[PDB]
Amino acid sequence: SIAQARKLVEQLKMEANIDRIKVSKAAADLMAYCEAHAKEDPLLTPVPASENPFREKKFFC
Amino acid sequence: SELDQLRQEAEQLKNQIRDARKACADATLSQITNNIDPVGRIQMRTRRTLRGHLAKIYAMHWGTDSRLLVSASQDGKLIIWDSYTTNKVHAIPLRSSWVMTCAYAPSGNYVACGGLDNICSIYNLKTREGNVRVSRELAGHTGYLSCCRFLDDNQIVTSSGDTTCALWDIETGQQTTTFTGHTGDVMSLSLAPDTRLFVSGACDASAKLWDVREGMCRQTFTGHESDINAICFFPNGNAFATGSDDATCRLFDLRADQELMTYSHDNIICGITSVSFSKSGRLLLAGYDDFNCNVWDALKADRAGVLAGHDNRVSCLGVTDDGMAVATGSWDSFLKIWN
Amino acid sequence: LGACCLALLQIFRSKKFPSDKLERLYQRYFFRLNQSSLTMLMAVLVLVCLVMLAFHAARPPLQLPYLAVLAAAVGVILIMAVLCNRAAFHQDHMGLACYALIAVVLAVQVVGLLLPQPRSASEGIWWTVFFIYTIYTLLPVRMRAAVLSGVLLSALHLAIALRTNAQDQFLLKQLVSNVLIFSCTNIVGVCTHYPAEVSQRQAFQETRECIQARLHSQRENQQQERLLLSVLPQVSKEMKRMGFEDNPEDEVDEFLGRAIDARSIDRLRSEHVRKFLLTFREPDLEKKYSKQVDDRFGAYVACASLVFLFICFVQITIVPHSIFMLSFYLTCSLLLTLVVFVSVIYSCVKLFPSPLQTLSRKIVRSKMNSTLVGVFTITLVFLAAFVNMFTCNSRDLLGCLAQEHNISASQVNACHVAESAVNYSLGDEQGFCGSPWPNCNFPEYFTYSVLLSLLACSVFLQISCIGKLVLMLAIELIYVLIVEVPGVTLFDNADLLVTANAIDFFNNGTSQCPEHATKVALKVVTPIIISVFVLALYLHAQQVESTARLDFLWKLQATEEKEEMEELQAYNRRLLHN
Numbered sequence: 007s008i009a010q011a012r013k014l015v016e017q018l019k020m021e022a023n024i025d026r027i028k029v030s031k032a033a034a035d036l037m038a039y040c041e042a043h044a045k046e047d048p049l050l051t052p053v054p055a056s057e058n059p060f061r062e063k064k065f066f067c
Numbered sequence: 068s069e070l071d072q073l074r075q076e077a078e079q080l081k082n083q084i085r086d087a088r089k090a091c092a093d094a095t096l097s098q099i100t101n102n103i104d105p106v107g108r109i110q111m112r113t114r115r116t117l118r119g120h121l122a123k124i125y126a127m128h129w130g131t132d133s134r135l136l137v138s139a140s141q142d143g144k145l146i147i148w149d150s151y152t153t154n155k156v157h158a159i160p161l162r163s164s165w166v167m168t169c170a171y172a173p174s175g176n177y178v179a180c181g182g183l184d185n186i187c188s189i190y191n192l193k194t195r196e197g198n199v200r201v202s203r204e205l206a207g208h209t210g211y212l213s214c215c216r217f218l219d220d221n222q223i224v225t226s227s228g229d230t231t232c233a234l235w236d237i238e239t240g241q242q243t244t245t246f247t248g249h250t251g252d253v254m255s256l257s258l259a260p261d262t263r264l265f266v267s268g269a270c271d272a273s274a275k276l277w278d279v280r281e282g283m284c285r286q287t288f289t290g291h292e293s294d295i296n297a298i299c300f301f302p303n304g305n306a307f308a309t310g311s312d313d314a315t316c317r318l319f320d321l322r323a324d325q326e327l328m329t330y331s332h333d334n335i336i337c338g339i340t341s342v343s344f345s346k347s348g349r350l351l352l353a354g355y356d357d358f359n360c361n362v363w364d365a366l367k368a369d370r371a372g373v374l375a376g377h378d379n380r381v382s383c384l385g386v387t388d389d390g391m392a393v394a395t396g397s398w399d400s401f402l403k404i405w406n
Numbered sequence: 407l408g409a410c411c412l413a414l415l416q417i418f419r420s421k422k423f424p425s426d427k428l429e430r431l432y433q434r435y436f437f438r439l440n441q442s443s444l445t446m447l448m449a450v451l452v453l454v455c456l457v458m459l460a461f462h463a464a465r466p467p468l469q470l471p472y473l474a475v476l477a478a479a480v481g482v483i484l485i486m487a488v489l490c491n492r493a494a495f496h497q498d499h500m501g502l503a504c505y506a507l508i509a510v511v512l513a514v515q516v517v518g519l520l521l522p523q524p525r526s527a528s529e530g531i532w533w534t535v536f537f538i539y540t541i542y543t544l545l546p547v548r549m550r551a552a553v554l555s556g557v558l559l560s561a562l563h564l565a566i567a568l569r570t571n572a573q574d575q576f577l578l579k580q581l582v583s584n585v586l587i588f589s590c591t592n593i594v595g596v597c598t599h600y601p602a603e604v605s606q607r608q609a610f611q612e613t614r615e616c617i618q619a620r621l622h623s624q625r626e627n628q629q630q631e632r633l634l635l636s637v638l639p640q641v642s643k644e645m646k647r648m649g650f651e652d653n654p655e656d657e658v659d660e661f662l663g664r665a666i667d668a669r670s671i672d673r674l675r676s677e678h679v680r681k682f683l684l685t686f687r688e689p690d691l692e693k694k695y696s697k698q699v700d701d702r703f704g705a706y707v708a709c710a711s712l713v714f715l716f717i718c719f720v721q722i723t724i725v726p727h728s729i730f731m732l733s734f735y736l737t738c739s740l741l742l743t744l745v746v747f748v749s750v751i752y753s754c755v756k757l758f759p760s761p762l763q764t765l766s767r768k769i770v771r772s773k774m775n776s777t778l779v780g781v782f783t784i785t786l787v788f789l790a791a792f793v794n795m796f797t798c799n800s801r802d803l804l805g806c807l808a809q810e811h812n813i814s815a816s817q818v819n820a821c822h823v824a825e826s827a828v829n830y831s832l833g834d835e836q837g838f839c840g841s842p843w844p845n846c847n848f849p850e851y852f853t854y855s856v857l858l859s860l861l862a863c864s865v866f867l868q869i870s871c872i873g874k875l876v877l878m879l880a881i882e883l884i885y886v887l888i889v890e891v892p893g894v895t896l897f898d899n900a901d902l903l904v905t906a907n908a909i910d911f912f913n914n915g916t917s918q919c920p921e922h923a924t925k926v927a928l929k930v931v932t933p934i935i936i937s938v939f940v941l942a943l944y945l946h947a948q949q950v951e952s953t954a955r956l957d958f959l960w961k962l963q964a965t966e967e968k969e970e971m972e973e974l975q976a977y978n979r980r981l982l983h984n
């Protein structure tokens with residue numbers, strides 16, 4: 007476990023040497039992606055039952 | 068000693084990380100979203116009940132056409148359906164009574180399954196001589212298989228309980244790249260749309276980010292107080308969600324490298340079973356062990372609605388690639404589609 | 407003599423399953439299956455109401471309340487059909503929808519029965535019989551409600567005919583025959599409803615049987631498997647994920663409900679059955695279904711023999727006794743009694759000698775032999791309905807009055823007939839104009855007898871709908887040809903005489919009759935009535951056959967999934983043993 011700890015050390019060396027981003031910037035970007043892809047979302051913008059395979063249904067006589 | 072000089076070095080590196088993180092914790096997702104309106108009551112109604120499985124359902128996977136889908140069950144059968152028609156495409160008796168996962172080739176030419184057998188059995192559905200026959204057995208893992216994902220028709224990634232995950236050159240049949248590091252059973256993994264990174268979760272109370280090309284751990288996420296039973300990526304690929312026995316679900320962003328949101332409730336005491344997003348992601352769906360499944364406003368973490376049609380843990384789920392409907396598999400032998 | 411009556415009183419106890427939850431789940435299935443039957447019923451009743459409207463509208467004077475009530479009845483029935491066709495109509499109200507329809511039919515019947523002109527005890531029998539039979543066959547009402555409605559409709563018809571027609575000397579013959587007709591229709595309706603309600607209750611209980619056996623055997627395999635894997639090796643999280651951290655009827659009813667929900671019926675029909683032929687698309691499915699045996703044929707034969715006795719009593723009461731008629735009926739009675747005996751021997755195999763036991767088993771085990779006997783029986787009943795008509799008079803009275811009155815036929819009205827009323831009246835059974843043959847003044851009772859024979863075709867529930875259609879169309883074609891081709895002189899003479907009798911002949915100082923036939927020529931009415939009955943009977947047969955085939959298909963899927971489950975259990979048990 008001696009070389010194992012050394013691995014843990016140089017691994018934290020890797021992790022601590024990353025460039026992070028402010029939560030505000032990231033969240034704004036995520037919210038923007040949601041907004042740009044909210045219009046395409048059928049579950050938020052229901053489509054005509056005709057187009058939906060699971061809603062197509064009608065018959066009388 | 069040097070262990071205590073590195074354990075305290077580690078403590079000061081965790082602290083250093085806690086410093087930058089708390090420095091980047093300028094605000095919280097909950098405060099920013101306090102202003103956005105709730106998604107409302109999301110009351111999707113079951114539209115197709117897929118039965119034919121004889122016992123608990125463990126895994127399923129849609130076809131890239133969003134019409135066919137594979138499912139696995141305790142009945143020792145793997146069923147492929149025609150969702151538009153629900154007609155069964157292929158019934159596959161299995162070699163073992165315990166399969167934990169299943170998967171579909173994006174092209175569909177092949178499928179794969181596995182479990183405690185330590186073998187991921189790939190099945191050919193379009194054999195030149197018109198048959199459905201086993202076409203490959205991926206052996207080498209020394210633990211039970213928990214999740215697996217292809218990279219191409221010749222490469223695939225699998226996760227095992229031996230503390231190792233492995234990428235296989237299927238034509239070779241041997242591990243092309245190894246992804247070790249977890250100190251607990253790896254449960255699930257999710258590839259990125261670019262198919263260049265992927266995240267894994269384990270019982271070691273740590274989730275890790277791996278570069279598929281490299282294979283090393285890039286980021287480690289924690290916070291849970293128990294083994295991470297599930298994990299899911301955000302649709303855009305800069306974030307992902309996690310689920311644990313700690314009775315919470317949490318959101319992490321790759322660039323922020325910290326938790327954004329937490330999902331849980333006080334009247335909720337049962338554990339969650341499976342999770343999924345809407346096409347835009349505003350909604351977060353989550354199964355529950357109390358026979359229920361709760362729908363949450365993912366941007367607001369408010370329980371939009373409840374999908375309670377099962378009498379037992381809702382084992383797994385998944386939304387169609389186009390977002391048309393949602394499938395849920397359960398121990399009641401019933402798969403339920405919602406919309 | 408008394409134990410049979412006590413057993414009959416035991417028959418009138420409405421069978422009910424003990425669980426109100428199970429009864430609700432059965433009702434949800436039964437209502438989903440019969441929503442189309444209820445809407446077809448509404449559509450056929452609309453057709454019949456339009457037919458009644460055309461018959462009354464074909465002849466003035468148009469009574470405003472009759473037209474208004476029929477238009478309102480049509481409107482209500484159409485509104486109810488549209489509401490019941492909206493998916494949002496709660497299934498618990500379908501029962502009420504059926505009682506409202508009876509009330510509409512009652513309202514249609516009351517206005518149907520009070521207003522029609524000219525008055526006859528034969529008027530409106532056809533639509534009354536239709537509505538009664540349709541309520542027995544197409545209306546899904548409880549036996550007590552069906553019986554109360556049929557008896558009420560019968561007594562109300564009889565009471566109306568008694569109130570309006572109190573002055574007719576021959577009233578007793580018509581009234582007795584109408585009583586006989588309504589008794590027969592109430593019986594035959596009981597004998598049709600009860601076996602259907604019984605086989606449907608039996609098939610549902612047998613289904614709860616097999617479903618219970620499947621679920622029970624799964625349940626036994628479950629605890630097995632549980633303790634199995636338990637021992638086999640914290641229950642590791644892998645083991646907990648495998649599904650172990652260690653009222654059954656309510657779990658059965660919920661799982662069964664989900665399967666009922668997931669197994670769409672119109673879809674299974676369109677996938678596994680050919681839309682038109684109704685044969686199973688797989689020949690092996692049809693061979694399995696053809697091995698399914700019926701058991702109650704002899705009760706239907708007994709009911710048909712009782713109907714035969716009622717037909718005989720009607721014919722003997724209305725039709726003068728002829729040695730030819732009595733000998734033909736005796737011959738048919740002996741043949742029919744022989745056929746009843748041969749059919750009943752299957753129920754009483756132990757009491758008869760070996761060759762008869764073998765014949766009876768070979769018949770009932772042979773759907774073909776029982777079908778052939780049913781067809782032969784019906785053909786004899788149809789023949790009995792008109793062969794005696796060949797002993798009815800056929801001399802032309804109208805050319806005879808033309809020679810006596812020396813007037814043109816196109817100028818003959820009921821007043822010119824009434825001036826010569828002394829020589830030719832409905833009361834004379836001596837063949838007028840030196841004819842040796844008696845008059846048969848009420849041929850519609852042959853049609854009603856044929857309707858009863860057509861109603862008798864309804865009773866043979868298992869004759870193929872195409873086989874029934876061919877037999878019923880042969881009955882229709884032969885009888886319509888006999889009413890139209892040979893009977894036409896008899897009908898024109900009877901319509902003329904009946905028109906004169908409808909006239910309350912009094913101090914008619916002037917030859918100014920109320921005029922107007924006031925009635926649609928019965929020769930024209932009979933074909934339309936028969937075709938309408940054949941259509942309704944075809945639609946009923948289609949619903950019956952579609953139901954029996956659907957019940958078979960779910961019982962088969964239940965058995966195939968059970969066999970598959972027993973195979974999977976036997977395999978896993980072998981592997982555990984292995």
Ligand SMILES: *C/C=C(/C)CC/C=C(/C)CC/C=C(\C)CCC=C(C)C
Nearest residue numbers: 066067449450452453456937938941
């Ligand atoms: C789809 C809804 C309706 C009401 C369609 C009705 C269609 C039919 C064929 C019923 C009408 C039946 C007749 C007018 C009877 C005519 C019979 C002959 C012309 C022989």
